[PDB]
Design a binder for this molecule. Structure first.
Ligand code: HEM
Ligand code: HEM
Ligand code: HEM
Lengths: 726, 726, 308, 83
């Protein structure tokens, strides 16, 4: 027996905070978190304890340490079928990654509506607040490979598979409400432009290179999503703290056959929150798995990601009532014009067991709809419909990918399709065609209807000639970027300028930089001038005189487009670094830890080595990590309690921890003699908003720190960070 | 409602003779025939009746007759996801066929040993007469594609998957006891030479072409199995009436560690029986599915194929006691020297439900052995071990082919292998490596032992240099061909000479024919001269003086090598054509049909059209097929009852039916005025052996006919057939 | 282990009647028959005479008769990379056959129009009577596997790839001028019904079984092509003696933008001829490669298949 | 075989030998080389046995393994010398 006598190898099967226990497969960590999908997977879950090691054919292995050879120093023999099977399986473990969104992190959960939506859709999953639908959700980046980093600047994917009683519905969305391009014909062009350039396959996980900016400068339709990517939307704090959007206008269809246009929204119940660029980039180096880890540990802790599903609903007779086209996926529907109706809530409460089997092999596709939903003629949506089943033929090895356990519907499925690579279902129907008499025509078609009916398309009128032509109504590129720009706070605007300025500096051909600045001058002069100044470019006379684009249906801003304009902060699940010394003031720790626990905020206790230190009353304090081992990048705030500060006051690493947190606009709290650190961050004797300081860590000091945490970052500090060398 | 009101679309779920009811999936035909493997397949069996038609995602389909278009005469729209899935799945139905043995027919059954073989092998499936092991057996030809014909001249595969409690064991054998070549390195050469020629891909299912006989003429090691293929062994009547062999010497290992050499046999309990060449060739035309059909219908009828497993056992100390090398797969072990010891019985008693899922995807591999068995250094076996896992990576799409339902062990299997295309099992083990502490090292290795122990190779001594060299003990090529020849009856020898003569006549380059004739003269002068005469080739004086190879350990024949020298006739499961007329003598038909039934011999009532005819007494007789529709090739014997013979006496099809059955040596019985057909086949007034005739079908008429059927064919008729124009 | 002294192993590279010489690869049988497509394949043609036997990595092999083993009666060794490559390539030879038309026989050739068709089409390959377009044509059955028989009763495919100066044009037609069904959505239903039945995978190359006639009886739109299949059109004497048709109405578009509806036809210049059933069925047994062989030998003899 | 899609991965241009390569292997997914040899097996007479084996020698010879002496039992065992 190799496990330690004390059983400390096995994590407790109960919710525990980040870092308290080793992480574990979801059915071991939380064996009684159940939903119909998780239960239906039981037939393929495989255990291990108390079983003999075997070949895949069931043969018990005696010696899993050696190949069969002629003599113990002799050649390996072809007859070693045990070594061959083991090496053969290893040799074939990898499958192609997804063409886009290869990097992603996934969890199981459930959805339930707040009320029956039968007046607007006959979709069974929306019919009853007591109808619970299992989901599997995968979040992702777009450009980088499956082994690239999480906290890159990128769009994020947000894909939900709903296992409904009437079919799988996949809502395959992103974290911004529009896309870069209008027509699916251009997708391979845009994707090839953003992906690593073809000669040398650089750069990974970055749009900051010549080909992406060349395409953008030549295709002004991209500029709206480009604005979102360059804003702090492009660098979320966590998958829990971003929005989700279906992007396209779809249709809901009710039992009477009425169509209503809908765009889908996911609202994060933990609020909106993003990193800042220097912090995100440094975090791709210190923890390229930061978002995947955060999601997994949030669920292991009981800080379940929750989202509210929202619909923007537009009556059919209102199709042409806006000054943009509802079918144009480079256009958003401002919430000031069409409010989001809150429709239900989705909770992600269990991690997978096996990343490969359940996350890597999951296949989502927006064409997977159910009765009660329908498409529109959005030309980006239309072409997506051809891509997501075809790509699964090579990625997942053939046309039976719906039989891979995670992809299986939980509802019945029966039809006349047969064979294909790795066919699992063994059909007993005498007939494989219809119409048939020899099985009395079963399985049989079902007419459409109010519930449990077959799928019928909404009978939309189509009138026009067969043309490859962009609708003239899509030919406006600057008004939504401007609406987004004017809706941002001044610090959000500064971060945009800085995103453009940083990316364009990495474009080697200067004419591309100049062409992009020309585009910006069609959006907003202030934006254009600020980026130009950072690039050593001077706007022309003509550029200074470009008329700004019109408002959007009378709107000159919409605060719902900002991450931060309207407070919606939530501290539950956030994390505080606590910087220890070798004789900590135990009374500070008690107060700190108590106040954090009350608000569900986690802590990590840091020092200059591993093991433990002992507090002034002899309390033994275990150390989670070192100052260098768990950088401030990985926490939301830093608290330094009182004690023997000289242990740490000349630790370069301790001082750095505080300078980095300060630069990144994180709340800092300093108690008693911890205020000696005020000198390393140049804080005035009388204080500075965003630095909490007191004689000791009482409940007033903690309430103040916790109020800074609710506001996420200390934006007022921005003009001050310029001076600190960090 | 398309089924007929009378429920006649659906076959009775009870055993019924061939042609009585439509054939059906085995679990519908025989729902009460069970074994552990068939029961373990229940998790993936899918029914159909009373279910709605859906996509693979579970969405009900309303109109499965039409694509979605703009206008009922307009263009098909990209948004038709239901059409798109259905056509995508069809588009990818096919998988590569097996490189060899692509044509094959399979069934489920079970095996049980007669007594415990613990004294000689610790194999669990052979430890207890009350231990039943489910099996799946596939029979096959070798050369032709999956769409080629059954009754070709070729070797046949006989592969048995034993689902044991200690792992899958696959006994992957053929219907002759030797192979064509000695070393696996030559397998691609040999197979390329027999398969269709690469410029034009001709001929299918035939060795009768230049490249095959060019290779044979240049590689005399092939001559032994070529003798078997040219004999009637190459054209079996049925997979139920051929022998099976593992060919290689393997080892049995008992609990005390003692190794015994073993060769595996299957004995057909239905006896040995083959077609004749003209009949087999013509049958590839009239019913290319004849063996597949015959196997399925025997099982539906309850004529379960039964086989007795037998072992030839040779003590380790007798390795070098024969004139041939036990490890040379081109040499048989004559049963006069080493008898087959009866070991147990295999019964095949249920058809699959879906041929593709269970037959086409089954994967057998002779490296799949279990503790108690082991390999030897046979250099053909040694190379097979590298082929059968490797080929399944492309054929079955990856390394998880053991998760395809038919291939799954019924015993436990657990290990540290992960991922690969189409991964079904969701592993929960915290560890994917060993040694590990985090899962207390589970699943764990198991030491070898007398039962339930881990696999350990027998510690055979290896001594020699690394060489690419054929053992000098393998360099003898003609004695085993000659033993086989001398062991055949005179009519079997004629059929051998005619096989060689027909095949070499299709060899376009005459020097190759000559070279083959020269090899035959090294085997037996009579055989060589008789083939030469048929080819218009004259042996040289040198050829006439080649001295014959020596006897094999003193044997100048071994009757167990003949199909027919020792009667083993079994009529149960055979079929008789009955040629009706429009006023049959009902008393003849009563006597004929009941006598056949009592011996389990089936009948097919034939006429010049379908429907019914009415007997003399008003009995309504349903017609199974027309004379052209179910030719004499498909039956074992022909009976013509008395009645209005003038009805059919001038029917060329009726007369030809008898001439064909006569030429192919089948018993023929003629009652009453049916004896008017005697002149068609030129029978003397006083009669001839092999023709049953009387005033009525009563008295001894059916017994005499059944006696002829027990003897299979009327070999004494061979001289009389040369003349007949049929 | 060599050639006969008399050179009789090797077919003459001149046209010869069927049976007169062993058949051979086209480039060795008729080296001076060329066209732009045949020439362009020269980069991948590989010869063999006078060259040493190698691995795929170019290593010369000394003994292609034996595996490497520890002693001449001993076990095969894992380090035999030459055995391993050879057996690996063998083990992966097969690719999936076509879902339909898996059985088929093909040849190279060339097309030219009799006059310019520029008044009704701007297609370049029909623009000039003296501009020749190479073609590759595959003729096929429908139902059976790639190892099924030629002279079955079935529809025949007749697919022509035209390598034009403005792109590949494939005219993918059959030997009757209609199909069995109206809407592509039913194709898997129809094909499943005519193909071997799914429990036992019988019958090969035959529509003569319950499922096909079930579908037909329930889908009267099939009756027209069924009449054709049941006539002697179902059993052609040769691919040289059947008609071809594109079946669908397509359009021709000329330089002025004018659309003309068109249906395509191939006329066999050797005339129309079919077997009779008893002969066709028996020939599936005596020579299941009859049409493949007949096509190949007609081309070797100079009886080139011609179609208008 | 799975990474590069089949057994003809040596015909992918970067992997191709620059020296000659000729043998009797055929087919496989994505087969580029179009073999004209009448024979796809050896020994053959119909192409005078080409391409032909080549004895080992000082230069341009066929591969023969060094005839290392092998002596021991068939074991799954680590050599004590490695411990
Ligand atoms: C509004 C625009 C789009 C959105 C919101 C979107 C969203 C996504 C998301 C979230 C994923 C990852 C799903 C997963 O986690 O496995 C994904 C994958 C994919 N998308 Fe899109 N996408 C868009 C546009 C397009 C277009 C226009 C195409 C092609 C025409 C395309 C083709 C694909 C393909 C090939 C994948 C890999 C799918 C797979 O392997 O399963 N996408 N998309
Ligand atoms: C004693 C000599 C041999 C016998 C009795 C034998 C028997 C068989 C049989 C019965 C099958 C068909 C199994 C099925 O029904 O799926 C088969 C398949 C096969 N054999 Fe052998 N075989 C022999 C020699 C070899 C050799 C030397 C090799 C190559 C080194 C080889 C490679 C293959 C391969 C590639 C398959 C296809 C296996 C698959 O796709 O699953 N065989 N053999
Ligand atoms: C007018 C009716 C049709 C005709 C004349 C036709 C003709 C043909 C021909 C001649 C081939 C063989 C090409 C070759 O030699 O490789 C073929 C292959 C094929 N056809 Fe059709 N066909 C028809 C309808 C359909 C339909 C409705 C579908 C599916 C929607 C279909 C799907 C296929 C597929 C999957 C192949 C295999 C193609 C390949 O593997 O390369 N066909 N067809």
């Amino acid at each position: 027996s190799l496990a330690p006598e004390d059983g400390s190898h096995r994590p407790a099967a109960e919710p525990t905070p980040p870092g308290a226990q080793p992480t574990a497969p979801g059915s071991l960590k939380a064996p009684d978190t159940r939903n119909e999908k998780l239960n239906s997977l039981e037939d393929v879950r495989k255990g291990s304890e108390n079983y003999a090691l075997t070949t895949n054919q069931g043969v018990r292995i005696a010696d899993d340490q050696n190949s069969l050879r002629a003599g113990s120093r002799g050649p390996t023999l072809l007859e070693d079928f045990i070594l061959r099977e083991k090496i053969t399986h290893f040799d074939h473990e990898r499958i192609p990654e997804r063409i886009v969104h290869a990097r992603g992190s996934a969890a199981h959960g459930y959805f339930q509506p707040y009320k029956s939506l039968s007046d607007i859709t006959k979709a069974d999953f929306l019919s009853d607040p007591n109808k619970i639908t299992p989901v599997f959700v995968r979040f992702s980046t777009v450009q980088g490979g499956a082994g690239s980093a999480d906290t890159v600047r990128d769009i994020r994917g947000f894909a939900t598979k709903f296992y409904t009683e009437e079919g799988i519905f996949d809502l395959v969305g992103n974290n911004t409400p529009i896309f870069f391009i209008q027509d699916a014909h251009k997708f391979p062009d845009f994707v090839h432009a953003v992906k690593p350039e073809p000669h040398w396959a650089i750069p990974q996980g970055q749009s900051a290179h010549d080909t992406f900016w060349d395409y953008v400068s030549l295709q002004p339709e991209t500029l709206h999503n480009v604005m979102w990517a360059m804003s702090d939307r492009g660098i979320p704090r966590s998958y829990r703290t971003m929005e989700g959007f279906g992007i396209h206008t779809f249709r809901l269809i009710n039992a009477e056959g009425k169509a209503t246009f809908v765009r889908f929204h996911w609202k994060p119940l933990a609020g909106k929150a993003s990193l800042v660029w220097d912090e995100a980039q440094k975090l791709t180096g210190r923890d390229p798995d930061f978002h995947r880890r955060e999601l997994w540990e949030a669920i292991e802790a009981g800080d379940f990601p929750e989202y509210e599903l929202g619909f923007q609903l537009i009556p059919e007779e209102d199709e042409f009532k806006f000054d943009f086209d509802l079918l144009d996926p480079t256009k958003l529907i401002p919430e000031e014009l069409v409010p989001v109706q809150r429709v239900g809530k989705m909770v992600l409460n269990r991690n997978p067991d096996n990343f490969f089997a359940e996350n890597e092999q999951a296949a989502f596709h927006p064409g997977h709809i159910v009765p009660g939903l329908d498409f529109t003629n959005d030309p980006l949506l239309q072409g997506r419909l051809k891509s997501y089943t075809d790509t699964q033929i090579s990625r997942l090895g053939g046309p039976n990918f719906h039989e891979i356990p995670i992809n299986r519907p939980t509802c019945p499925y029966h039809n006349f399709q047969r064979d294909g690579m790795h066919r699992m279902g063994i059909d007993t129907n005498p007939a494989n065609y219809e119409p048939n008499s020899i099985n009395d025509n079963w399985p049989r078609e079902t007419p459409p209807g109010p519930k449990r009916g077959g799928f019928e398309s909404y009978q939309e009128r189509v009138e026009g000639n067969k043309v490859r032509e962009r609708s003239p109504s899509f030919g406006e590129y600057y008004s939504h970027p401007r609406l987004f720009w004017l809706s941002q706070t001044p610090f959000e605007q500064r971060h945009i300028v800085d995103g453009f300025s940083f990316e364009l500096s990495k474009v080697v051909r200067p004419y591309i930089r100049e062409r992009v600045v020309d585009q910006l001058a069609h959006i907003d002069l202030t934006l254009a001038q600020a980026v130009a100044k950072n690039l050593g470019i001077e706007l022309t006379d003509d550029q200074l005189n470009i008329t700004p684009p019109p408002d959007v249906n009378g709107l000159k801003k919409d605060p719902s487009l900002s991450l931060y304009a309207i407070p919606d902060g939530d501290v539950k699940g956030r994390v505080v670094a606590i910087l220890l010394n070798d004789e900590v003031r135990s009374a500070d720790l008690l107060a700190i830890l108590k106040a954090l626990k009350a608000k569900g905020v986690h802590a990590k206790l840091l020092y200059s080595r591993m093991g433990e230190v002992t507090a002034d009353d002899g309390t033994v304090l275990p150390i989670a990590a070192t100052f260098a081992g768990a950088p401030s990048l990985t926490v939301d705030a830093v608290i330094v309690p009182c004690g023997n500060i000289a242990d740490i006051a000349d630790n370069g690493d301790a001082n750095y921890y505080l300078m980095e947190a300060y630069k990144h606009l994180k709340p800092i709290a300093l108690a008693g003699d911890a205020r000696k650190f005020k000198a390393t961050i140049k804080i005035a004797d009388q204080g500075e908003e965003g630095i909490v300081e007191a004689d000791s860590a009482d409940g007033s000091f903690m309430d103040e720190l916790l109020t800074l945490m609710a506001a996420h970052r200390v934006w007022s500090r921005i003009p001050k960070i310029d001076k600190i060398p960090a």
